Design a protein around this nucleic acid. Structure first.
Ligand SMILES: [Zn+2]
Lengths: 146, 765, 164, 42, 228, 49, 110, 50
RNA sequence: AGACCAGGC
DNA sequence: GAAAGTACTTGACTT
DNA sequence: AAGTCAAGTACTTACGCCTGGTC
């Protein structure tokens, strides 16, 4: 998780003060937005990959998610190892305030964990601004079906 | 145990919540109402003057509620209990003092009762204010009742908190196709009126209104706004450089070709093109009909006697929309709490009471007109006894209005439905849960998902958990544990003080200026336009935090849009927190130990400049920490108790953060449907429908919130063992399995109480 | 280190300050240039000062348009609204000490035409009432005053100076 | 072209002069122009 | 993609949102024809290549001066030299403005003269000024934008958004034999009937075969037949 | 004088209008006699059908 | 960089305004205008303190009897062509003292 | 599928509270630790978790 | 009979 | 205040 | 002066069912 942070921090410091090759994703700031979305994605799945692999036999959630009962390997992975990238609307947590997610974060919010990202599982608990982000996606998906 | 920094921070909430109760809203507003509003409304019309007879005049000197002479109060005012049993309403008499004058040349006085009026529970004028123990046992009622509800005509109903769109403020929205639109609404006394600015085509922009017929060429309006010189205009709404010139230059071009100047064609144009004349005292007709118009039409909020104030304001209103016409974004959407303000019942009751009083006037004036047109024996009285039998129209009129929920106004002429709601009593939570709940009005949009999904700005000012899953989703919210709703202070003693701080009057200022720094806006109105924002802000906040004007009137800087805002307009949520000066907190240990032990209570920290309230768009400018450990000394403020983010109803769930938001939402809805023991007076109380529990028990795992709200004293549920296993097969999907002989010693044993009412009447026979 | 003394002068008829946004500074090192010929009109309690400035026949006068429409070859006309705000003083430095005389009321100067309102009429022709129109109906009626502007200065100092 | 007249300072519009000449003058006030007008926008 | 797209089909409305059109060109190549037909069919490059637009008034003549920079037409491929924009300039003249005169001297400078409520010439030219850097030099009056994308494994092709169809199919440089277009109703206006019915059952099957499950081939064909 | 605006006054084309009034709700929307309703609960022992 | 930019101007302004104050010293007619808070208390009541350069080149205004009021500088200028005129009793007219030079405001402080 | 781990912890914190004869606190973002409950259990002869 | 509001799936 | 579509009385452009 | 292709204004429907209290 930490090795996936400063790498993006190295990419985000080149955002305003530097130049980089842009995909045909149109304009700037969308370029790294697709990159930060791609990087943190793989890292998430990768952390949860080794989790279930080394998990002990005869456990209930594995066997239950194994055959017919309930849920999938993706669900139990969020319980134990790590969650990540809460995303509504097709993008990342649009700013409520001016150029910032929450007042608890510095101006011009860019770096991961400042927007729609949580490195904590359901077991370990949730940091205070790891919560509201999850409340968003929960509210969004709930009103959707309704 | 020694006093640490991570402990006493939690001790702050009980000190805060003990002074101001969990429900501030209804109480505090009704108390301000019966004193301030009552004396102000009667001051609006203190006189009634009718035409006949050589001279007649009548003056109301004072109006009070159920208090005069040596009597502390009414001999016995019916308690809440007995009032509920006899189906009678809950009310106190209205005492008035008037001065009557006849053609017998007299000046005299009296004390009369114009009618009744409902009194809310737990109020200064109630019998339950500051009472303890045996006083309640004698009055037959529960000490733990929340209060703040109106009981009338049998059962009891509650006035629900209603949200309202921003009043008297500029809001700008952008649209596909046609263009950009900004809306302006306000109310001055008797009437409410809305202005709509619009750009149809060409970049040349129009002004739409219900007063003026069709879409005036504003460049002409601005001429009627007192300005002549042209390019001064351009140098105002556009100013110095870039692309802002050519766009507005189009309208500037073709406006001055056909008809050009500030005086002649300016006023006459609007006046000839203007709609219906209201038919009475109409003809001054000249350039002067537009005078009255140009003063009060749409922008009447500013008005006064000059043309300079209103002009620049409309120009600055044109300034912003031409900026977002250039490129997308750069606008203000209407979603978040920052642009929203809620209004407590205190104002609504005043609006309803003043209407019925106005209706009485003309009828009372015409009442004496009868004998007035009668030939002989001029009458001293029957402006007493005959208006007493003519009275009580206020009683039934107000009682029907509060019982129905349909309010009829002849002034604003706004008929509002679905205001009052019957308080639902099932458990102890449902009573406290329905209160402290934010409702909403209009805006339609069952289809639109825009005003539905939660927004990050809501954090800490509202409950992010509680919500009534169903047809209405997200349209009704709830307040957090620690919040404060803003009142209104005053206007005049700010400007004069602001001038002392180095700002100057806009009149003397030459207006070429977008160029020098920011400018100070008072409730949206440009006044000072001062340099050096730093010393201005800091010193002003210092005068706030220390010796004067606490709570509201907060100042925040605007970086991109160039200005500095000062807003004194109340009716908004405020949240407490702690100031960190330099690198460390302002609290510092021993100060809080002096608190918990013997003294120092609350609100003293505001006097010492420790804790205060952020607000409005100022919460955006500041910087808030999480924990005392986390502090990096770039921080303006820290936060006290981060777990206050959830509401009062959502504080029941143990380990909420371990779960997911959809699970916590369902519990908030189901948690109020649980069956409790309700109150202590419960057995002496006759309800319409009620469910009871036999052997209630507290939860094995409690919460810090449930103790402060007094939950476990009146718990709802049955603490029991359980096992997680696959058994039965009558279980399977979402179905449990119970155990007999556990249930035969009883489990969750209930009781169902209903009632029936009959009346023996008497006909005309 | 040193001391700069300042004084506060007396009443002295008070003052009225002129400003106009039409002509900017010459951008040269010498900022000062001034209008001429005066001819101002005046009324009580709201004055609405009128300013008259000459018109040169020498440069770009366009005579053919004038003779067709107006006699307006005559002196240019400017007007303006006065306003007052407290706590404003004026200053001038004499020797090593500073002296200060309070300004009182202030006014803005921007023009208009009677060659218009009169021309618009000749083209077209052939119980409460408070607030705005009250400042209008009374205005047009009560204003006629002839003010002769004469500039010279000697005692403007010594009058306030001896008051120390 | 967005020009302006000294003094009154409103605007300058092109008016057709009699017999072959093209001039410009400020509206409602006496004035005239030497022409040689130019403007460029990219 | 999802259910509101099926709404667009079922309703069979005239217009529709982002109606992309697919077309094949010749073969697979990076240079020339790939970018040639890309710069052929769309919008107006007039406001782009215009360099600087000058407005001059000298003596008794009124002058509109637009001098084109040859640098852009060289890099961005459009087929003409000068006169074909001049006939495109007179197109604009014929459409919304006037038929008077046109001039050609050097560096692609085009002069426009006007002459006859008073002082209308100034107000006339004022409007003609701003309206000039708009009108289409080449391409059609349809496309909102186009894209060159990598087709299949290694191949290349383009997808276009517009109501054009037949005209862009008629456009030389691209093989129009095998193509496709959305909003079936307009396909009925060209191929018609059968081919349109084959297209409407093609899109219905596609978009509903992605999100999940199966509707089977049988039930779809009957739905498109009873309509057609 | 006073005021108008009573909505329901329409007496004919409304009761006959679709949805609730006649054609949809009442006519093809009729009510079933000999019926019953109650909650649900599982069991292994009952064979399907 | 809030405090930075402002203190940079405060230094300059406290110098530049001193020059143009002493640049007009002798008596050709040159005028400046002031803006001060109301109620004007000073010290004695029979029926004021003054400006000067603070130590190390700074600039401090003041009044007498334990009060310190310091403020300088002004909002942007170069537009105004200004002269105050003399009107008395409505009698005679319009005595002109000539031109104008500077502008300055004074804010109180701690 | 419903994915709530907060309930499964409640039993341990609840069971440990009864053995000590004390009401066990819990709250969002903090509160009584799960680990100390295990050692409160295991010393009385119960398996550490549940 | 025609009404309302809360809420259930 | 809903948005989406469909249907119904007038102008350039020709002959 | 018919025959003409393109324009401003005006309309009917957008959720299955039930179960409670109140005027
Ligand atoms: Zn001019």
């Amino acid at each position: 998780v930490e090795i996936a942070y400063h790498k993006c921090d190295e990419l985000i410091t080149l955002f305003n003060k530097g130049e980089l090759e842009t995909q045909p994703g149109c304009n700037e700031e969308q370029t790294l937005e697709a990159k930060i979305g791609g990087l943190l994605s793989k890292v998430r799945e990768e952390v949860g990959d080794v989790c279930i692999n080394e998990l002990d036999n005869w456990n209930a959630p594995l066997i239950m998610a194994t055959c017919g009962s309930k849920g999938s390997t993706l669900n139990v992975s969020q319980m134990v190892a790590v969650v990540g990238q809460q995303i509504i609307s097709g993008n990342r947590v649009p700013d409520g305030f001016q150029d910032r997610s929450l007042p608890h974060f510095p101006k011009n919010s860019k770096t991961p964990q400042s927007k729609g990202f949580v490195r904590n599982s359901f077991f370990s608990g949730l940091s205070p601004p790891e919560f509201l982000f999850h409340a968003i996606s929960g509210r969004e998906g709930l009103v959707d079906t309704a | 145990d020694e006093i640490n920094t991570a402990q006493d921070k939690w001790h702050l909430l009980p000190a805060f919540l003990k002074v101001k109760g969990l429900v501030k809203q209804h109480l505090d507003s009704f108390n301000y109402f019966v004193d301030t509003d009552l004396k102000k409304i009667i001051k609006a019309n203190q006189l009634i003057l009718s035409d006949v007879d050589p001279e007649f005049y009548l003056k109301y000197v004072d109006i009070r509620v159920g208090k005069k002479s040596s009597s502390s109060t009414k001999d016995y005012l019916t308690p809440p209990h007995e009032c509920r049993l006899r189906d009678m309403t809950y009310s106190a008499p209205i005492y008035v003092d008037i001065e009557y004058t006849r053609g017998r040349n007299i000046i005299m006085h009296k004390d009369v009762e114009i009618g009744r009026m409902p009194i809310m529970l737990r109020s200064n004028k109630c019998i339950l204010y500051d009472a303890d123990e045996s006083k309640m046992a004698k009055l037959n009622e529960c000490p733990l009742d929340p209060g703040g509800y109106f009981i009338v005509n049998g059962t009891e109903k509650v006035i629900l908190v209603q949200e309202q769109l921003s009043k008297n403020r500029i809001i700008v929205e952008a649209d596909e196709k046609k263009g950009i639109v900004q809306a302006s609404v306000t109310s001055s006394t008797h009437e409410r009126k809305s202005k709509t600015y619009v750009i149809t085509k060409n970049g040349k922009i129009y002004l739409k209104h219900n007063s003026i017929a069709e879409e005036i060429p504003i460049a002409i309006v601005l001429k009627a706004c007192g300005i002549l010189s042209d390019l001064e205009i351009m140098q105002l709404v556009c100013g110095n450089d870039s692309s802002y010139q050519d766009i507005f230059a189009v309208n500037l071009e073709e406006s001055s070709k056909l008809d050009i100047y500030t005086q002649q064609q300016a006023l006459e144009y609007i006046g000839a093109k203007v709609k219906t004349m209201r038919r009475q005292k109409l003809t001054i007709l000249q350039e002067g009909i537009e005078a009255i118009a140009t003063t009060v039409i749409a922008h009447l909020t500013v008005e006064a006697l000059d043309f300079r104030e209103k002009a620049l304001y409309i120009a600055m209103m044109t300034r912003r929309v031409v900026m977002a016409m250039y490129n997308p974004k750069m606008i203000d959407d209407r979603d978040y709490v920052g642009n929203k303000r809620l209004e407590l019942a205190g104002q609504l009751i005043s609006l309803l009471f003043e209407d019925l009083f106005k209706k009485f006037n003309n009828d009372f004036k015409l009442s004496i007109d009868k004998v007035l047109k009668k030939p002989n024996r001029a009458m001293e009285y029957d402006a007493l006894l005959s208006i007493n039998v003519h009275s009580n129209n206020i009683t039934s009129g107000l009682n029907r209005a509060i019982s129905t929920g349909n309010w009829s106004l002849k002034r604003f002429k706004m008929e509002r439905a679905g205001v009052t709601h019957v308080l639902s009593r099932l458990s102890y939570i449902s009573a406290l849960g329905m209160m402290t709940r934010i409702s909403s009005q209009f805006e339609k949009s069952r289809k639109v998902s825009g005003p539905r999904a939660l927004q990050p700005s809501q954090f800490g000012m509202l409950c992010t958990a509680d919500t009534p899953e169903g047809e209405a989703c997200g349209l009704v919210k709830n307040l957090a544990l620690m919040t404060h709703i803003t009142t209104d202070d005053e206007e005049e003693p700010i400007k004069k003080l602001c001038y002392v701080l180095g700002v100057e009057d806009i009149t003397l200022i030459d207006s070429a200026s977008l160029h020098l720094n920011y400018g100070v806006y008072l409730n949206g109105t440009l006044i000072g336009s001062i340099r050096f924002p730093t010393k201005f802000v800091t010193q002003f906040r210092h005068l706030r935090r220390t010796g004067k004007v606490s709570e509201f009137i907060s100042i925040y800087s605007n970086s991109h849009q160039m200005a500095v805002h000062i807003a004194t307009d109340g009716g908004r949520i405020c949240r407490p927190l702690i100031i960190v000066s330099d690198g460390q907190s302002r609290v510092k240990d021993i100060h809080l130990r002096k608190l918990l032990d013997g003294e120092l209570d609350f609100d003293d920290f505001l006097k010492l400049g420790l804790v205060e309230y952020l607000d409005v768009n100022e919460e955006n400018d500041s910087y808030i920490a999480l924990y005392e450990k986390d502090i990096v000394p770039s921080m303006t403020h820290l936060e006290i108790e981060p777990f206050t983010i959830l509401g009062a109803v959502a504080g029941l769930i143990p380990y909420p953060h371990h779960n997911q938001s959809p699970r916590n939402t369902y519990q908030c809805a189901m948690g109020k449907q649980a069956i409790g023991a309700i109150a202590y007076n419960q057995f002496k109380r006759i309800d319409t429908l009620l469910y009871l529990m036999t052997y209630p028990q507290q939860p094995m795992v409690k919460t810090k919130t449930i103790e402060l709200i007094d939950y476990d004293k009146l718990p709802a549920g049955q603490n029991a063992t359980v096992a997680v296993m696959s058994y039965s097969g009558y279980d399977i999907e979402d179905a449990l399995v119970l155990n007999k002989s556990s249930i035969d010693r009883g489990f969750g044993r209930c009781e169902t109480r209903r009632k029936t009412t009959t009346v023996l009447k008497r006909y005309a026979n | 280190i040193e001391e700069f003394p300042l004084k506060i002068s007396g009443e002295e008829e008070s003052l009225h300050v002129f400003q106009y946004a039409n002509r900017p500074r010459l951008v040269g090192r010498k900022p000062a240039e001034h209008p001429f010929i005066s001819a101002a009109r005046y009324k009580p309690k709201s004055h609405l000062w009128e300013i008259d400035i000459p018109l040169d026949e020498q440069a770009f006068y366009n005579k053919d348009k004038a003779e067709s429409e107006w006699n307006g070859v005559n002196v240019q006309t400017l007007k303006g609204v006065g306003v007052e705000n407290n706590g404003q003083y004026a200053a001038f430095v004499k020797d090593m000490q500073v002296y200060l005389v309070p300004i009182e009321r202030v006014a803005q100067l921007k023009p208009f035409f009677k060659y218009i309102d009169d021309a618009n009429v000749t083209r077209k022709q052939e119980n409460r009432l408070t607030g705005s129109l009250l400042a209008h109906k009374v205005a047009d009626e009560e204003a006629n005053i002839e003010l002769t502007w004469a500039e010279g200065t000697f005692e403007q100092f010594k009058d306030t100076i001896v008051k120390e | 072209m967005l020009s302006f007249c000294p003094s009154c300072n409103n605007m300058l519009l092109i008016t057709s002069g009699d017999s072959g000449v093209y001039t410009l003058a400020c509206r409602s006030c006496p004035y005239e122009f030497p022409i040689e007008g130019i403007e460029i926008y990219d | 993609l999802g259910v509101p797209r099926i709404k667009e089909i079922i309703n069979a409305s005239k217009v529709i949102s982002t109606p992309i059109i697919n077309a094949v060109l010749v073969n697979d190549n990076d240079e020339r024809a790939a970018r040639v037909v890309k710069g052929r069919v769309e919008k107006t490059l007039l406001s782009d290549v215009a360099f600087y637009v000058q407005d001059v008034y000298k003596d008794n003549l009124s002058f509109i001066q637009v001098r084109i920079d040859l640098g852009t037409i060289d890099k961005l491929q459009l087929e003409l030299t000068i006169e074909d924009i001049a006939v495109a300039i007179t197109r604009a003249s014929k459409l919304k403005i006037q038929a008077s005169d046109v001039n050609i001297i050097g560096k692609d400078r085009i002069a426009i003269n006007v002459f006859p409520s008073e002082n209308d010439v100034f107000y006339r030219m004022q409007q003609l000024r701003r309206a000039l850097p708009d009108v289409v030099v080449k391409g059609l009056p349809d496309i909102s934008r186009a894209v060159i994308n990598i087709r299949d494994d290694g191949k290349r092709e383009l997808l276009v958004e517009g109501y054009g169809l037949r005209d862009v199919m008629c456009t030389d440089g691209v093989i129009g034999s095998r193509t496709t277009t959305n909003h079936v109703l307009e396909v009925f206006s060209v191929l018609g009937i059968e081919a349109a019915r084959y297209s409407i059952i093609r899109e219905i099957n596609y978009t509903m075969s992605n999100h999940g499950m199966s509707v089977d081939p049988r039930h779809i064909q009957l739905l498109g037949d009873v309509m057609t | 004088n006073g005021g108008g605006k009573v909505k329901p006054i329409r007496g004919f084309c409304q009761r006959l209008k679709g949805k609730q009034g006649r054609f949809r709700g009442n006519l093809s929307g009729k009510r079933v006699d000999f019926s019953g309703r109650t909650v649900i609960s599982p069991d292994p022992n009952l064979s399907i059908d | 960089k809030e405090a930075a930019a402002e203190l940079e101007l405060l230094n300059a302004d406290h110098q530049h305004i001193l020059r143009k104050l002493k640049k007009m010293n002798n008596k050709p007619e040159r005028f400046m205008v002031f803006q001060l808070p109301t109620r004007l208390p000073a010290f004695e009541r029979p029926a004021v303190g003054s400006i000067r350069v603070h130590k190390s080149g700074k600039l401090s205004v003041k009044i007498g009897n334990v009060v310190m009021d310091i403020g300088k500088g002004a909002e942007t200028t170069f537009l105004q062509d200004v002269i105050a005129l003399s009107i008395a009793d409505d009698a005679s007219s319009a005595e002109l003292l000539g031109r104008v030079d500077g502008k300055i405001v004074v804010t109180p402080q701690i | 599928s419903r994915m709530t781990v907060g309930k499964m912890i409640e039993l341990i914190s609840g069971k440990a509270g009864v053995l000590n004869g004390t009401l066990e606190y819990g709250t969002c973002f903090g509160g009584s630790k799960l680990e100390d409950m295990s050692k409160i259990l295991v010393d009385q002869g119960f398996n550490y978790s549940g």
